Symmetry: C3
Subunit: 429 residues, 3 copies
């Protein structure tokens, strides 16, 4: 029988709602087929995921190892013994013996049963850990793909901007050969060409970095995607009901992992309690003994045996009690671990929801800012050509425009990352 306490799910340590559903699979969540191809390759070759899988196998074997202690054993033994007096009759006594021994712990109070159940729960927790590694890998690959696509997009506008600046310089140069511009404007036009070449070199380096990070996550080194067209339709951003229960968090593999670890600590309390009670064992066997080897296996030399035994703990100066205290305190730690995983998960979902609002409003404002900067640039150019303002008006407007284009690219990436984090924080596929 078992002395373990019944499992009771701890109270939810977070609010009932995220303020004021089930995730699609990742093959539906991701629309972009290039990112899905990368995800499937990583699932096959990624070494972190492979390690996590092997840890599940190890835990299953550790369970089987512990479960084996519940079953009878059968072992053999053989011995030869020579001995004699150091003085007097110095004649040698010789005896050979043989044993075939069966052994069985009856486990009436469920000590071995619960040590086995603890290890089975560690195995279950380890499968959930593997599932967490799995959904984090999907998330990480996707983010790295959008980072690569960000580098391509930044590189593209850097190169377009370089061409624009070269055309401007050519124009100022022509104007100068007619007294229409001065050497200050020429030099201002000349400088931004060089700063833009620096930006191109930066974005080329970011692309190479993005590629190397991708190959590490994939665990394979074949061709990587070229520049793609990526936008807010590249994923199916999650649509959550207004009054979404935080109970959806309990679906996350990291939370399920903590729950099984808690069930393991419950089983360990059971094993600790059983130490106070008597333990009953049974040994039974066949034996032989003979002073000579030839008649060692003769039935005439043989015996059978059957010995049931009981051990009874009476006073142990608090060994058993300290051991139980440890098991109960570790169970309390497992409860707290479970609460920490839920509070952390709640914070992840809450932050992603707030960042979602943030990024959509920044992106909308930056798009309108960009439109105004385009108009400013066009108006500055007209006024500059007619000698009504200095070339600093054109430079200032050009610089701001290019800066805002880069910022807008970065914000759209952040939005992709956040949509992926939200999906993953809700448990992924």
């Amino acid at each position: 029988c078992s002395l373990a306490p019944d499992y009771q799910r701890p109270a939810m340590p977070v609010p009932q709602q995220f303020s004021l559903y089930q995730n699609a699979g990742w093959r539906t969540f991701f629309v972009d087929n290039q990112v899905k191809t990368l995800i499937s390759e990583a699932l096959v070759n990624n070494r972190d995921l492979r390690m996590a899988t092997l840890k599940v196998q190890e835990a299953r074997a550790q369970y089987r190892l512990t479960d084996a202690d519940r079953y009878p054993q059968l072992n053999g033994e053989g011995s030869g013994s020579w001995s004699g007096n150091l003085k007097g009759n110095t004649a040698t006594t010789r005896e050979f013996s043989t044993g075939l021994n069966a052994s069985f712990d009856l486990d009436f109070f469920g000590r071995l049963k619960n040590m086995s159940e603890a290890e089975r729960q560690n195995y279950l927790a380890t499968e959930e850990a593997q599932r967490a590694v799995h959904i984090l890998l999907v998330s990480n690959v996707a983010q790295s793909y959008f980072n690569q696509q960000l580098a391509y997009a930044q590189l593209q506008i850097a190169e377009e901007t370089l061409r624009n600046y070269q055309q401007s310089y050519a124009f100022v140069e022509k104007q100068l050969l007619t007294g229409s511009s001065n050497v200050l404007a020429l030099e201002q036009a000349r400088g931004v060409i060089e700063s833009t070449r620096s930006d191109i070199a930066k974005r080329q380096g970011e692309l190479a970095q993005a590629n190397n990070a991708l190959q590490l996550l994939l665990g394979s080194y074949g061709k990587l995607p070229q520049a793609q067209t990526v936008n807010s339709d590249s994923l199916q951003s999650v649509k959550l009901p207004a009054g979404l229960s935080s109970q959806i968090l309990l679906q996350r593999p990291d939370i399920m992992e903590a729950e099984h670890a808690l069930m393991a600590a419950n089983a360990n309390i059971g094993a600790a309690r059983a130490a106070f009670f008597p333990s009953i064992s049974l040994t039974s066997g066949i034996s032989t003994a003979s002073s000579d080897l030839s008649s060692l296996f003769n039935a005439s030399s043989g015996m059978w045996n059957f010995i049931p035994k009981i051990e009874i703990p009476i006073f142990n100066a608090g060994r058993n009690q300290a051991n139980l205290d440890i098991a109960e305190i570790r169970q309390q730690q497992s409860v707290v671990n479970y609460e920490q995983k839920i509070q952390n998960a709640f914070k992840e979902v809450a932050d992603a929801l707030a960042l979602r609002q943030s990024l959509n409003d920044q992106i909308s404002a930056q798009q309108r800012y960009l439109a105004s900067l385009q108009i400013t640039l066009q108006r500055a150019r007209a006024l500059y050509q007619h000698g009504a303002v200095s070339y600093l008006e054109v430079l200032d407007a050009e610089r701001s425009l290019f800066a805002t284009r880069q910022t807008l690219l970065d914000l759209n990436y952040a939005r992709q990352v956040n949509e992926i984090s939200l999906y993953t924080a809700l448990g992924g596929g």
Copy 2:
């Protein structure tokens, strides 16, 4: 008796002074009452601190478990034995036996005593670890509160700046309807409104983030503080004597933790040394034996027993010596661990003192910069209205002003964080 070496505090591995006192309690250090209310709530509900507390309880129980091995034990045993020949007289021999056994390890050379003292020192080290978690929690809550207050303050000036920009745009619009301004100026005024809306969205997102981080640290989800007025009087920044001894570092809980771990390794050397010496044990008991169950508890079937025993290690191919080497090397590692904690602590205090100077001088300079930018803006506006300069003068001055206001807010926050880190690095309350 004990073979452990006497404890000797390692030499201070850092300078005597921080270049060229006792901390108040945190209820005195913090003036702002809102942050103190948050700290008290976190002390009750924070899960990290609760875990640390449970680890102290576990360590206390592990100590009690190990101490129990020093005391006599009393246990009972019962057995039934059936056996017989496989050939010849196949008649079954039957014997029942009973044992009440006392056991005692005399521990003359202090092996069990020192294994117990090591575990007591682990318990003491674990209490200090709990105290470190405690003062770090106070520090972390306070920093998160000032981060929240920074978000409110950034949001406020972003909204004020938006209003300013809207008033400017309205003015340029009126001027345009009278031929007094041109479409370039109108568009420049229009654009910064949109960039400022992007900043508002950013600061709203930072506020929400700040709030979620706060609730995670608190472990509770009630109302959070609204915007407060926060300044350099919100804490009582520490006043340190010019020639402050680095010996104040030895008060830090992380350093006290390392010291007890070192005392534990000393005890372990004692336990390892005792392995070379004889061990004396004592067993004493009452027993019965009978071929039938009914006379099993008869005094006629009973005996008493008293068996003192000595085991003497002679040659073990260097098992004992390798084990001692391990204990001595681990003690040396504990010394190095202690030195690492002190060198790290010194670096934390030294950095905070340098950052203190840095931030006060940056803040003073930025305040004077801000005053100059205000004047520049006013002068640019006058000149612009009189047609003496382009609207770029107004835009440039407006942009710089808003940027410097944000920087100044960020510097004052950094100063708060640094004052809190210094206080905590000196051991906190």
Copy 3:
């Protein structure tokens, strides 16, 4: 004999080349003598390296501990036994005994041999870990030195820039006292002086930070280097053949560490396999027994003994098989660990090579940008003095110039760091 499988190096989990040699020692790689002096001091006093060294000693002792189990043991035992009936003849029986016992496990199937070989491989892996700590320390000290030198260089140009701004302000002030300038220009000139004072305070703080980080790495607190002249000749940047084999990665200590850990897991499979086979042991000794103490050591009371013994596992409900499964799965994990270290190392080299290209091209572009900005500033000043443009032209050009000088310093530092990381990623000295 041994049942361990032969070691087979896993296939290279990365490409054959880095796209499309041996490192010099660090005393040749580093030219700057100041950084080499710092490296030598850290090698002596750094606490992390000292800890790593002590872990090698501990592992060597653990090996010696495990190896000792392969050798015969000799131990002594002494006993006194008093006993008697609880009823009837209540006369006390007394017996004293003595034992000198030799013991030897023959280890025919290599269980103890392989447990010893596993521990020797852990020792070898630990020496490699120490070597990794060593080359990382060299890298970290060097990077911290160049960070310190960056702070000095940033501080220097900040102070030079302050002087420039003060001279400009003085000039605008003189012009104002003659009606030649207006109060807007005066205030613009005044403001940048104050922003530059903020930058000086920042760079002084960065210098102090750099110094404290350096002393922590050194483990000593003597004088630190003053400002030096540092450039691309300060190190001998590695020159790699076009078709460099990725096999150079297998020289890295972290990879060699993983390989020995894999050899340890191979030995553990051998130990696990031996559990299925019989184990043969031998005990031999001298004993005495006497009812009185005086004749306890008499040869007349003595005996000699010789007892060889065999234990034979037959059925254990899968205990042995689960244990073997665990060893085989852990070996598979060790293979994966080895592959992870190589894939990570490849990524480090690949990134450094890409960053090298990036930084050289950014630095070249920024130098040309700087040259253009100098010319722009000179042209703006001339035009401003002649009343042809506003002072905003001078301010804009001054601000950009100072920003680009700081960026260029930061890029040259990044290049130093990257050259050091590449060298270290290739295995260091």
